[PDB]
Ligand binder design. Sequence first.
Ligand SMILES: [K+]
Ligand SMILES: [Mg+2]
Ligand SMILES: [Mg+2]
Ligand SMILES: [Mg+2]
Ligand SMILES: [Mg+2]
Ligand SMILES: [Mg+2]
Ligand SMILES: [Mg+2]
Ligand SMILES: [Mg+2]
Ligand SMILES: [Mg+2]
Ligand SMILES: [Mg+2]
Ligand SMILES: [Mg+2]
Ligand SMILES: [Mg+2]
Ligand SMILES: [Mg+2]
Ligand SMILES: [Mg+2]
Ligand SMILES: [Mg+2]
Ligand SMILES: [Mg+2]
Ligand SMILES: [Mg+2]
Ligand SMILES: [Mg+2]
Ligand SMILES: [Mg+2]
Ligand SMILES: [Mg+2]
Ligand SMILES: [Mg+2]
Ligand SMILES: [Mg+2]
Ligand SMILES: [Mg+2]
Ligand SMILES: [Mg+2]
Ligand SMILES: [Mg+2]
Ligand SMILES: [Mg+2]
Ligand SMILES: [Mg+2]
Ligand SMILES: [Mg+2]
Ligand SMILES: [Mg+2]
Ligand SMILES: [Mg+2]
Ligand SMILES: [Mg+2]
Ligand SMILES: [Mg+2]
Ligand SMILES: [Mg+2]
Ligand SMILES: [Mg+2]
Ligand SMILES: [Mg+2]
Ligand SMILES: [Mg+2]
Ligand SMILES: [Mg+2]
Ligand SMILES: [Mg+2]
Ligand SMILES: [Mg+2]
Ligand SMILES: [Mg+2]
Ligand SMILES: [Mg+2]
Ligand SMILES: [Mg+2]
Ligand SMILES: [Mg+2]
Ligand SMILES: [Mg+2]
Ligand SMILES: [Mg+2]
Ligand SMILES: [Mg+2]
Ligand SMILES: [Mg+2]
Ligand SMILES: [Mg+2]
Ligand SMILES: [Mg+2]
Ligand SMILES: [Mg+2]
Ligand SMILES: [Mg+2]
Ligand SMILES: [Mg+2]
Ligand SMILES: [Zn+2]
Lengths: 61, 105, 159
Amino acid sequence: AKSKNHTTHNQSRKWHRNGIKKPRSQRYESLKGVDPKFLRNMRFAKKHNKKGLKKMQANNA
Amino acid sequence: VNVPKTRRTFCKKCGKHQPHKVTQYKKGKDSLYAQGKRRYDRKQSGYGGQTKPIFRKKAKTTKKIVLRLECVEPNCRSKRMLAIKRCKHFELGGDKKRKGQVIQF
Amino acid sequence: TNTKGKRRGTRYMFSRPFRKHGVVPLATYMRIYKKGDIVDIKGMGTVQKGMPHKCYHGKTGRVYNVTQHAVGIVVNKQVKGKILAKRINVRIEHIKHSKSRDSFLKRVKENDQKKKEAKEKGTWVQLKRQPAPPREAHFVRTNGKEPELLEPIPYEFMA
RNA sequence: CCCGGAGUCGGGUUGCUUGGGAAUGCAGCCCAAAGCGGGUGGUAAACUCCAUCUAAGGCUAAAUACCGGCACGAGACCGAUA
RNA sequence: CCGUCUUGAAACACGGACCAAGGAGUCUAACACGUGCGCGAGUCGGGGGCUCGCACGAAAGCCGCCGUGGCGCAAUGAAGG
RNA sequence: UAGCUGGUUCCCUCCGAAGUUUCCCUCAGGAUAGCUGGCGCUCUCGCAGACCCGACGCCCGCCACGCAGUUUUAUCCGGUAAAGCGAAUGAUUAGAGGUCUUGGUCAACCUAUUCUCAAACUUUAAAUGGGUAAGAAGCCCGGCUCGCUGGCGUGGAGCCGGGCGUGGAAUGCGAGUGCCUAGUGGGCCACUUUUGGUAAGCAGAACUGGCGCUGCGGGAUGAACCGAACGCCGGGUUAAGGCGC
RNA sequence: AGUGCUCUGAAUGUCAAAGUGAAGAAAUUCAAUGAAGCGCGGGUAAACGGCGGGAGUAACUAUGACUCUCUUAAGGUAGCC
RNA sequence: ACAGCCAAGGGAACGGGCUUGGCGGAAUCAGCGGGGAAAGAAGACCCUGUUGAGCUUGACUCUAGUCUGGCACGGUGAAGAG
RNA sequence: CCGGGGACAGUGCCAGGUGGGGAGUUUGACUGGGGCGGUACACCUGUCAAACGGUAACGCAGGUGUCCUAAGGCGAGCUCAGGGAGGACAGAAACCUCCCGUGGAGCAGAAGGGCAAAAGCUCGCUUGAUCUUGAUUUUCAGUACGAAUACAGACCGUGAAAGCGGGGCCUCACGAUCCUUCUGACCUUUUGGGUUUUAAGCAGGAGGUGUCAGAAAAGUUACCACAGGGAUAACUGGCUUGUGGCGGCCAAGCGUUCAUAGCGACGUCGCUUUUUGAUCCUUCGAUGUCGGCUCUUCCUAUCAUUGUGAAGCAGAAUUCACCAAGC
RNA sequence: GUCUACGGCCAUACCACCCUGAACGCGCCCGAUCUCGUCUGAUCUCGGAAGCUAAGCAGGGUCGGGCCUGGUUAGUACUUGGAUGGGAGACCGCCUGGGAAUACCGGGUGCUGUAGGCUU
RNA sequence: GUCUCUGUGGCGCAAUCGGAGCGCGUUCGGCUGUUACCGAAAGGUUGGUGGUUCGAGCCCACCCAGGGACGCCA
RNA sequence: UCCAAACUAAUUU
Ligand SMILES: [K+]
Ligand SMILES: [Mg+2]
Ligand SMILES: [Mg+2]
Ligand SMILES: [Mg+2]
Ligand SMILES: [Mg+2]
Ligand SMILES: [Mg+2]
Ligand SMILES: [Mg+2]
Ligand SMILES: [Mg+2]
Ligand SMILES: [Mg+2]
Ligand SMILES: [Mg+2]
Ligand SMILES: [Mg+2]
Ligand SMILES: [Mg+2]
Ligand SMILES: [Mg+2]
Ligand SMILES: [Mg+2]
Ligand SMILES: [Mg+2]
Ligand SMILES: [Mg+2]
Ligand SMILES: [Mg+2]
Ligand SMILES: [Mg+2]
Ligand SMILES: [Mg+2]
Ligand SMILES: [Mg+2]
Ligand SMILES: [Mg+2]
Ligand SMILES: [Mg+2]
Ligand SMILES: [Mg+2]
Ligand SMILES: [Mg+2]
Ligand SMILES: [Mg+2]
Ligand SMILES: [Mg+2]
Ligand SMILES: [Mg+2]
Ligand SMILES: [Mg+2]
Ligand SMILES: [Mg+2]
Ligand SMILES: [Mg+2]
Ligand SMILES: [Mg+2]
Ligand SMILES: [Mg+2]
Ligand SMILES: [Mg+2]
Ligand SMILES: [Mg+2]
Ligand SMILES: [Mg+2]
Ligand SMILES: [Mg+2]
Ligand SMILES: [Mg+2]
Ligand SMILES: [Mg+2]
Ligand SMILES: [Mg+2]
Ligand SMILES: [Mg+2]
Ligand SMILES: [Mg+2]
Ligand SMILES: [Mg+2]
Ligand SMILES: [Mg+2]
Ligand SMILES: [Mg+2]
Ligand SMILES: [Mg+2]
Ligand SMILES: [Mg+2]
Ligand SMILES: [Mg+2]
Ligand SMILES: [Mg+2]
Ligand SMILES: [Mg+2]
Ligand SMILES: [Mg+2]
Ligand SMILES: [Mg+2]
Ligand SMILES: [Mg+2]
Ligand SMILES: [Zn+2]
């Protein structure tokens, strides 16, 4: 006939068995979702980044 | 609702805002040679009776109102469909309401 | 069963403080949010565009994106079994810089100030703050007085 | 000089059938042919080039099937409640 | 006092007098991953064929680019491509 | 045919659940994610110097990362409990002081007080709690790139060199990651908070622990209480509970 | 009145296939023409069935022959309880 | 199933067995109907199942039969009308 | 053959009607048992909810299937509810004027939040309620729809401009596949080539599934069947005791006087399990189900009898208590 | 010492009332040809410079009201953890840690940035 | 319990069409020797209480007084 | 051939 409707009993110890693991961040996260006008400048700031190795290497040395 | 029967909106054929003629969309008549109708009439032929489901519920009381929009630029006179929200009483080019006068005895 | 409405139960959360209604003070609009700084997400009620959902009110995340009026924050959210990082877009009325980081930036600027000046005095100065040691031995003067005797008061009944 | 199978093809429509989808085949019923014609050329139609075959008569071995029959041979089978 | 279903069985829940014997996750196909082996940008005869006379042998061997073909080595688009 | 009953055959070893989410003509079922096992793999500490033996480099000082049902130190977050009503909104008891009048001395009215309230009121406001942080993915120097931004050598992001280890709270701990995957999706009880009900060994939630899966000592007896969790034994000592027979 | 059954078919509204006409290169499309039936019109309850409420009123009171009314296809008659 | 004396407790909330008490003496005979929630029967009532069947109809799809139109068998003369 | 009909009837094939005579099938779910009622079946606000979020009951208080060429978008100028004091007719309400007025108004609607040179009211100009591709949020499996938020690219409106605007101040107002229809590309196929109709596609709207992740659906069975179910009702048992039954305490009153001989209002505290509700723990591979008859035993909350106490107990009869269930 | 323009935090800055305000400024003020608005040069817009600190504004004052901040309230209310504590219950003590709000009683009454004046 | 529904002048009862009426009665003249007919006038918290609204008897929420209908396996 | 009903209990010749 009727039955139990809802409970979160036992749930807090279910998901502590394999731990509640934090999201493992890494260096160099993804650029998915940044401003599109911002992002095509940065692709242009790296497309022309070789334009000036010779001035840069004759300035570290 | 009360939409006016002229409107400046975007015309995709020319890529500008152009004057349009707002007209209400009507469902055309069925083809009798379309592919789902030809499948349907082949499936109903013979013995077996009714083969596809017949709906007969009609929970809705309104329909979405679709406006066909035709641009009045004369050399390309393309048409666009435009849907607005559900409404019971739809008029088109009706009287503009105004806040001054007395209504009504 | 409750509704799954977007502002269910935010009667007091998204309201305003007492006698702090009205025009937003204008210096919440001229903060500067660089990418990668820690912001506290709160959420006003005076501004309805761009408010975060109620599960983020009082969380804290870092900035990954900056627009004209808003920001992109990476916030941890503990849904039932796992914490997953959420990317939310919030207009900058609803956030503020977190001062939880700035005490740590106060002492990183204090430690580099004292490592290139540590050696020439022979100083090995303490950098690791230690968790509140027990009290050391000391003396307590009576100054001729004697300590006041305390004794419990008798009971009496009013209310 | 001589050259070919008609209530048949084909069309409509109804029913079954098929992967056959604006109809693959088969049947009923109505209509009903042509002779440089006819059929086919997987989307219904008109137009036109091209390809392809010659329906409405007939015969035919082999390779193929075989829990019945006659007669054999064998088995990592069963061993008398099997 | 055992099997059983059940939140809960010694149960006034069900099945079971006793003994022997039989008695219930199989086989085929298709997939998926894991593992072992062989060959490796290839791989595989599975069908057919060739081989003292068919105890075993209805086995085993061989073919040659018989590699026809399958899968793999190229994707994407509804399609022209 | 059966989403329904019933049965389903040898032993030891290790690991060990779920009755919860979402969807379903779904409520005696399944899919879905949790929970389980197996197979691994990627790394770390390293093994420790034959018997030996703390060591063998640079007066000090130091001893890898990461991680956590935990605290500390910073710092945000909240409107419950309490309190409040001579604070708004509501509910509300009594006198008093004023005196204007479409009340008939009475009320109404006003001002200052006064009694008692609030799951769907609140100025105020805890305890417990929730989030983030506590470094090398850093810090300090130089330069370069940009089509973005622009009074400007601007602003911002990126890039390239160079320099800094006192490893920048405590305590504990080896960690990461992939594939395949069974069983479950009827739960029940107890402390505290809590809703409906006169109540119920009643119906429904929250938090944690337990029973289901689990024996043992104690409560005479008992799924769940109290103590304590289990290889087969000897000795010793306890727990809760006991000590007339 | 309802539901049936039945008669009538007038110029009758609706109304299939074929047929007729036009448009088109054709498939096709449109129009005209309109059988039964339905709709419209009568008849029929020893067909199926059906057959009300509310107020006021006699000179003691109480009743209510009478009166007024909403109302339906008729408002339950002779009888009997 | 094994069995067979009771009270009370606790317990799946009415025990032959368990706890605590009362107690318990072979082997049988005729009776008796308090118990064994005795036996007979996979509860008929009640509910559930995306299991049915008999029967009704204003359910949904059909259908024999009938009613009506069309074409065919299907012909010969007249008259009208177009 | 003789009569009688006769191109009608009839038969064959197609078409329309009628057709429970016959066939097949269906006849939701949740649910303090089921049915009836409701919809807790898709949504929204406040509360419950225990100060992050999440959180159930046929828990409470409500709402929703719409409305809007402005009630959308900008800009400007204004200030509201109410109160007071005045002003020909004019008063409880007409209009005029000054003063007070922190929102006590208003903002389409439910509630909650927001809002004052405004988000309100009034004028001006307008169509950003348009064309696009992704990312994100909310529900969440972290899938879809819906809704929403930040951008970016176009074209635009408004404003002197900064700017602001891709509907409604925010939280609700809505819908897959298949099919149909419409719009769009001097677009792709239409099967040996070509041309033209037709058809099929690609992309975006619409027509709708309210059982709202989306079957096409009426009853009855007492003539009934089957699989099961103590997951679930009816009798018995158990917990509870509102209700039923029986007592206590306090003392306004009644008792001609006099609270309490006998009583006992307004209150309030209990017991009992012969009632019935309430529940659903046990039994559905069955515990024979009301009453009477017969027969035994037990309870006491005593009707009588033995022994007593009290009286509004003269006697008689009667009433109130005690020990008491022997009979 | 103080103002002006533009602000930041938004009452310690607000409200009522009284007093003072040198010099600058800010205002009130005077006018309507132009610009631009009105029923109305009142507002708005424009052109001015006779008058005045009356008002705004500023500074001060009030056993002022509010507001800000301390004390008390009070280790009180409540609360984390704990017990084979108590009590028929309702509830209540203790252990271990945390710890409020009125009424009541004090104190306070704007700070400050950028640019430019004025004050002998 | 739930859902509909009625309420209006003395009486039965309209308009449900957001912008107060029939019939009958009662007064009051007439006609008549004197008590149908003719003439005219009067009369309504339109249940109550709040809402919504340019505006309510008509539309909403509640209360009342009445009605009606929806349930059965023991 | 339009409708057209009724008439102190209150007594004295
Ligand atoms: K019955
Ligand atoms: Mg469940
Ligand atoms: Mg047919
Ligand atoms: Mg077939
Ligand atoms: Mg073709
Ligand atoms: Mg042959
Ligand atoms: Mg034998
Ligand atoms: Mg034998
Ligand atoms: Mg045999
Ligand atoms: Mg033998
Ligand atoms: Mg059970
Ligand atoms: Mg057992
Ligand atoms: Mg039992
Ligand atoms: Mg059974
Ligand atoms: Mg048996
Ligand atoms: Mg055997
Ligand atoms: Mg393999
Ligand atoms: Mg089932
Ligand atoms: Mg079961
Ligand atoms: Mg709350
Ligand atoms: Mg409280
Ligand atoms: Mg179990
Ligand atoms: Mg304990
Ligand atoms: Mg009678
Ligand atoms: Mg027994
Ligand atoms: Mg017996
Ligand atoms: Mg059964
Ligand atoms: Mg059965
Ligand atoms: Mg089912
Ligand atoms: Mg059936
Ligand atoms: Mg029908
Ligand atoms: Mg039938
Ligand atoms: Mg049901
Ligand atoms: Mg909480
Ligand atoms: Mg404005
Ligand atoms: Mg744009
Ligand atoms: Mg607006
Ligand atoms: Mg061709
Ligand atoms: Mg019968
Ligand atoms: Mg039960
Ligand atoms: Mg009682
Ligand atoms: Mg007396
Ligand atoms: Mg239960
Ligand atoms: Mg029996
Ligand atoms: Mg029996
Ligand atoms: Mg007695
Ligand atoms: Mg002027
Ligand atoms: Mg002045
Ligand atoms: Mg002055
Ligand atoms: Mg003061
Ligand atoms: Mg009346
Ligand atoms: Mg029955
Ligand atoms: Zn155009």
